[PDB]
């Protein structure tokens, strides 16, 4: 930028374009060569997309070319970390965590005949000796 008698000093990219907001004419004063000046103005014109703080729920942003990327926390996902893992517990989502049958309404798990639902409310276990869909010679001894 140009303040009182600033242009008496030699131009510097740091003080003028980085520390303040330089114009194309101030950039030309530092690079002199036009072809190299234009190459700088393309990348310089692309601002910091993280200035708006798009990320959410304690996510960190990183500026990119005409875009950005959000580093979400473990329990979060999405372009802006807006999605929570826990708020998706339904039968479409990994069978709702149920080992066998699932039902929407909190989702309720159930078991096929011959099995029975445990205390965890998701796991099934055989109640009979020969439950369906299991190989005895592989689940014995």
């Amino acid at each position: 930028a140009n303040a009182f008698l600033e242009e008496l000093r030699p131009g510097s990219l740091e003080r003028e374009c980085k520390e303040e907001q330089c114009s194309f004419e101030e950039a030309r004063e530092i690079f002199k060569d036009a072809e190299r000046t234009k190459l700088f103005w393309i990348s310089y014109s692309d601002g910091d997309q993280c200035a708006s703080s798009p990320c959410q729920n304690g996510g960190s942003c990183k500026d990119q070319l005409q875009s950005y990327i959000c580093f979400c926390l473990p329990a979060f996902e999405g372009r802006n970390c807006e999605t929570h893992k826990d708020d998706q517990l339904i039968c479409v989502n990994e069978n709702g965590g149920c080992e066998q049958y699932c039902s929407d309404h909190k989702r309720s798990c159930r078991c096929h005949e011959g099995y029975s639902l445990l205390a965890d409310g998701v796991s099934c276990t055989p109640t009979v000796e020969y439950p369906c869909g299991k190989i005895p010679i592989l689940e014995k001894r």
Partner: protein, 198 residues
């Protein structure tokens, strides 16, 4: 009909931050996205969303070497209508993020230029891994440096994140590094980093 198939399924990935995008906006319908490997089961993401995008980062970081295929279903609001996305191999197709010159330092007729390690979205060990922890010997950085009084631009390259270049004494230099993977026909080079002068 009661539904229309999605289209323009495109992959948007940078530092393994993978986003699937498609069209159009929903009208009397909702979308569900599925993703799998070549021989893996289909896992669903973004269940019945009105969004025309879906973040698949958590699914592909489990193994960035694997080729992934996805599809977008269309439910109204025997099988529902859908559309397949192009195959996607993260390790070979993800865009290299814009590098950043961490620091530079001169000692006489030589200058050292250090590059900041770019953190990726691969959250191994409960922390984001850097760009070099993934590609290793495949990743290199190219340095573009020049004088204000130079005609063209000199170039340097390093297997690490530090350049050890020679300079003309007294002269003022500028710098700009670029991430590169020579073992790539597509997405071979990143975008140029911000300039840093002495």
């Amino acid at each position: 009909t009661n539904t229309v198939a999605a289209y323009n399924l495109t992959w948007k990935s940078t530092n393994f931050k993978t986003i699937l995008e498609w069209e159009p906006k929903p009208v009397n319908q909702v979308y569900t996205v599925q993703i799998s490997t070549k021989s893996g089961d289909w896992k669903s993401k973004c269940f019945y969303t009105t969004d025309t995008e879906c973040d698949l980062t958590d699914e592909i970081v489990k193994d960035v070497k694997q080729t992934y295929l996805a599809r977008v279903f269309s439910y109204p609001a025997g099988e529902p209508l859908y559309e397949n996305s192009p195959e996607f191999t993260p390790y070979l197709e993800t865009n290299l993020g814009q590098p950043t010159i961490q620091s530079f330092e001169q000692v006489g007729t030589k200058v050292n230029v250090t590059v900041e390690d770019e953190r990726t979205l691969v959250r191994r060990n409960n922390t984001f891994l850097s760009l070099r922890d993934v590609f290793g010997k495949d990743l290199i950085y190219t340095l573009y440096y020049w004088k204000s009084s130079s005609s063209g631009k000199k170039t340097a390259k390093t297997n690490t994140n530090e350049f050890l270049i020679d300079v003309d004494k007294g002269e003022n230099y500028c710098f700009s590094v670029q991430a590169v993977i020579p073992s790539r026909t597509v997405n071979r080079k990143s975008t140029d980093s911000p300039v840093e002068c002495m």
